[PDB]
Amino acid sequence: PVWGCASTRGRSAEMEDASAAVPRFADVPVRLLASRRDLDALGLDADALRLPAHLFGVFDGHGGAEVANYCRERIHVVLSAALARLGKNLGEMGEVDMKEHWDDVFTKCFQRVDDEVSGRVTRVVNEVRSEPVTAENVGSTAVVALVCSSHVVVANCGDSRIVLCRGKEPVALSIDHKPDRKDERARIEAQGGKVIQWNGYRVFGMLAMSRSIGDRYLKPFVIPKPEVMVVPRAKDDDCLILASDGLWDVVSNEEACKVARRQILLWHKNNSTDPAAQAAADYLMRLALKKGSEDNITVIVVDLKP
Amino acid sequence: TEYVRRFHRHEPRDHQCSSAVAKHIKAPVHLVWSLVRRFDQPQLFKPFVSRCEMKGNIEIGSVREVNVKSGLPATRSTERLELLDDNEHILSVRFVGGDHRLKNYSSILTVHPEVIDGRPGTLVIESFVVDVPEGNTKDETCYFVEALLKCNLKSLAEVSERLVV
Numbered sequence: 252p253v254w255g256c257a258s259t260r261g262r263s264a265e266m267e268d269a270s271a272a273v274p275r276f277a278d279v280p281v282r283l284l285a286s287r288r289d290l291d292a293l294g295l296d297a298d299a300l301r302l303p304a305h306l307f308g309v310f311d312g313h314g315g316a317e318v319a320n321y322c323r324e325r326i327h328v329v330l331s332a333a334l335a336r337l338g339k340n341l342g343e344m345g346e347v348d349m350k351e352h353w354d355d356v357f358t359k360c361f362q363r364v365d366d367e368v369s370g371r372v373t374r375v376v377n378e379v380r381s382e383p384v385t386a387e388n389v390g391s392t393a394v395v396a397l398v399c400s401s402h403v404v405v406a407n408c409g410d411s412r413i414v415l416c417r418g419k420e421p422v423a424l425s426i427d428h429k430p431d432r433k434d435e436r437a438r439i440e441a442q443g444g445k446v447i448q449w450n451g452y453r454v455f456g457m458l459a460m461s462r463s464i465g466d467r468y469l470k471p472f473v474i475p476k477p478e479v480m481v482v483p484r485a486k487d488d489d490c491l492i493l494a495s496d497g498l499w500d501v502v503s504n505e506e507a508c509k510v511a512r513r514q515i516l517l518w519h520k521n522n523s524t525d526p527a528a529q530a531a532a533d534y535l536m537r538l539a540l541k542k543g544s545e546d547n548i549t550v551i552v553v554d555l556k557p
Numbered sequence: 558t559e560y561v562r563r564f565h566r567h568e569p570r571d572h573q574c575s576s577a578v579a580k581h582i583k584a585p586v587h588l589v590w591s592l593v594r595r596f597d598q599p600q601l602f603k604p605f606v607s608r609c610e611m612k613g614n615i616e617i618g619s620v621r622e623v624n625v626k627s628g629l630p631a632t633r634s635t636e637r638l639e640l641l642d643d644n645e646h647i648l649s650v651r652f653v654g655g656d657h658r659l660k661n662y663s664s665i666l667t668v669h670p671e672v673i674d675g676r677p678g679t680l681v682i683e684s685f686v687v688d689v690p691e692g693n694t695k696d697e698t699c700y701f702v703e704a705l706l707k708c709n710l711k712s713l714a715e716v717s718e719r720l721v722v
């Protein structure tokens with residue numbers, strides 16, 4: 252247990268946020284983490300080695316909770332299977348650039364779950380299902396962080412956010428897919444869509460994000476293509492924070508980091524999830540409530556120090 | 558378009574915009590109308606409606622308070638029944654409240670008989686006039702309202718077609 256998770260309906264009537272925490276959810280081929288020539292100096296073969304990893308995910312649903320739930324139930328399974336296939340294929344490739352392969356695995360994973368939600372591919376239920384999971388106006392953000400001893404790999408889709416706290420300073424690991432972002436607006440308008448400022452910048456004046464799972468009623472303008480970032484860990488790292496807009500709309504990255512560092516430190520000075528990280532997640536959830544957040548609030552804190 | 562000039566001609570003032578959208582439904586008129594006419598249950602076909610509260614029986618002047626699902630720029634709207642003609646199959650509504658930005662929104666929805674693939678079908682036409690909110694163009698307003706109404710009609714068609722074989 253290296254994490255804590257806090258969640259609340261908040262001032263909203265229904266709960267449409269979800270989150271996942273799957274320890275040892277898959278084994279990461281070491282080729283995606285080190286080079287062959289780097290492991291051979293030790294006498295080890297990067298192709299055979301496997302590094303167990305954990306998965307943490309935040310899914311801000313909208314128009315319903317079905318898509319955030321489904322993401323919470325499927326992304327880690329699909330991603331585990333994909334990392335197995337990629338572990339096999341990587342043994343027959345020779346030294347290539349791994350970043351491309353992280354993008355490949357995460358992009359195909361998200362796109363896969365999206366096609367399942369959209370009824371475009373048949374899925375298993377142990378039996379098969381092909382009808383869409385839910386109505387076409389239901390969708391969900393999906394920010395997922397794979398953690399292992401060496402790397403933190405992030406796949407972001409939507410307006411949820413993950414912030415890495417390093418050396419008492421904040422480092423953003425995902426960039427919100429707000430439809431007014433230059434590249435996002437340019438891509439939407441190039442495809443014939445329109446971004447309208449209607450209580451915020453929104454796609455066709457409706458959805459205040461440009462990428463998401465589901466929402467097949469706004470395709471191809473809203474896409475499930477994630478932004479991936481491979482971040483090597485450092486002994487100077489403190490912790491990781493995933494959360495829905497219900498936290499970042501009223502709290503900043505700086506304050507979130509300062510707060511999380513303080514909380515974990517205080518717990519360790521004063522003494523299933525991890526008690527310290529859980530304390531940080533509860534304190535951030537209640538801080539977002541105290542700052543007047545009217546959305547569902549979901550927060551995950553991953554402790555990165557041993 | 559012969560129906561548009563008879564039931565859907567608006568005279569939007571200069572600070573307004575007006576438009577329409579249509580949808581072919583592969584179902585009989587009486588079924589589609591039986592769904593639309595239920596002024597107290599718009600979530601029967603309207604996909605963005607989470608709840609709807611209306612008191613008393615349905616009559617001209619009835620007001621319903623509608624809550625919409627997340628993923629939209631507003632959360633509630635207050636609407637009044639202005640026209641409910643069962644003989645000509647006409648439904649007209651006006652937005653009198655809400656936390657949205659469609660002030661003086663008026664919509665006219667008509668259901669006409671049609672022949673789709675040599676079988677009985679329905680042509681649904683919904684038109685509207687609305688005030689352009691500050692900081693937006695008439696075109697922006699129309700793309701917004703048209704996106705929403707296109708969703709509404711598509712959903713209506715799926716509900717209707719799912720009740721006829």
Ligand SMILES: CC1=CC(=O)CC(C)(C)[C@@]1(O)/C=C/C(C)=C\C(=O)O
Pocket residue numbers: 603605625629630631632633634652655657658659702705706709
């Ligand atoms: C879904 C929707 C989005 C808004 O911003 C306004 C409002 C709250 C009125 C709402 O109902 C509007 C619905 C519309 C335009 C037509 C309808 O449903 O007949």
Ligand SMILES: [Mg+2]
Pocket residue numbers: 267268311312313547627
């Ligand atoms: Mg939400």
Ligand SMILES: [Mg+2]
Pocket residue numbers: 410496497500
């Ligand atoms: Mg937000």
Ligand SMILES: [Mg+2]
Pocket residue numbers: 311495496497546547
């Ligand atoms: Mg939210």
